[PDB]
Amino acid sequence: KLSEEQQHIIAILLDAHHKTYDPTYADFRDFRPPVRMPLSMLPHLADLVSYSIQKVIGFAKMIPGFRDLTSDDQIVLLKSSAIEVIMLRSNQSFTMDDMSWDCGSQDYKYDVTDVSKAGHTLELIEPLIKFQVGLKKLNLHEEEHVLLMAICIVSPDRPGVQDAKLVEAIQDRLSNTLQTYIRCRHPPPGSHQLYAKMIQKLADLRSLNEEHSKQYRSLSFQPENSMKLTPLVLEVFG
Amino acid sequence: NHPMLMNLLK
Ligand SMILES: C=C1[C@H](O)CC(=C/C=C2\CCC[C@]3(C)[C@@H]([C@H](C)[C@@H](CCCC)CC(O)(CC)CC)CC[C@@H]23)C[C@H]1O
Numbered sequence: 001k002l003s004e005e006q007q008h009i010i011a012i013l014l015d016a017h018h019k020t021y022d023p024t025y026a027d028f029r030d031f032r033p034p035v036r037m038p039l040s041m042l043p044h045l046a047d048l049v050s051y052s053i054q055k056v057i058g059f060a061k062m063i064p065g066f067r068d069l070t071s072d073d074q075i076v077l078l079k080s081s082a083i084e085v086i087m088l089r090s091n092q093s094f095t096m097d098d099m100s101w102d103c104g105s106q107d108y109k110y111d112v113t114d115v116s117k118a119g120h121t122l123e124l125i126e127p128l129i130k131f132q133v134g135l136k137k138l139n140l141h142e143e144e145h146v147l148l149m150a151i152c153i154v155s156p157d158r159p160g161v162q163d164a165k166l167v168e169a170i171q172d173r174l175s176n177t178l179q180t181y182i183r184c185r186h187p188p189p190g191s192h193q194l195y196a197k198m199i200q201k202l203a204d205l206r207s208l209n210e211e212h213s214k215q216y217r218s219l220s221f222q223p224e225n226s227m228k229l230t231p232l233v234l235e236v237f238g
Numbered sequence: 239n240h241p242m243l244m245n246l247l248k
Contacts, residue, residue, distance in 0.1 A: 057243075075244065
């Protein structure tokens with residue numbers, strides 16, 4: 001079974017996600033307005049990204065063991081997993097009806113044309129959509145969603161890490177919870193290699209990250225475009 | 239140097 005500490009970890013991660021994720025998307029009215037008719041969607045989406053980073057930061061601080069890390073290990077982990085964890089948390093609004101992210105209204109319904117009007121090409125967007133579809137098909141419990149997001153943040157393989165053993169032991173505690181949770185709470189056939197498919201998704205995110213790094217560096221090459229971004233977005237990415 | 243990031247985490 002799931003032990004008391006493992007139940008504790010889950011209760012924490014769920015509540016931490018409930019406090020950083022507003023399924024009504026109310027605060028979307030504060031972003032620079034979307035324009036759909038080049039880079040005409042970069043201001044609105046740069047804003048949603050900047051907001052999303054703040055939300056991921058607030059979630060990170062609630063991960064049991066994250067507070068034991070040094071301020072520097074804390075910065076390296078969040079800096080490299082930011083786009084990955086935002087990709088993961090976006091799956092909660094992604095709809096397979098039309099392959100898009102549906103955030104309340106038609107104005108905040110983003111599709112492949114909107115993401116391409118943010119200055120990014122199909123080389124990344126096609127794998128991004130395929131990723132969201134494969135994640136949706138896993139039909140994870142909200143508990144599995146929060147654990148995966150936590151495991152993706154506390155990864156010891158991220159370059160610049162100092163106390164790799166500490167990050168490792170924090171992640172193992174989250175991994176074991178997840179593995180136990182699938183075996184105790186998740187029933188067949190949905191549980192079938194569900195853990196291995198969840199880890200595969202983490203690998204698909206490493207690929208999406210690496211391509212993101214490239215297309216971001218070319219988009220932000222021209223000052224006219226990094227001029228449309230946010231201070232936080234520029235600090236996290238470059 | 240990541241002042242905004244260190245602030246949000248403090
Ligand atoms: C609160 C939520 C909601 O579920 C919606 C939501 C969806 C975000 C999506 C869907 C539309 C396109 C986004 C916003 C992507 C951006 C266009 C980025 C491109 C994503 C390609 C990986 C652009 C960027 O390069 C990010 C630094 C510069 C603006 C990132 C996540 C994507 C964010 C999430 O935090």
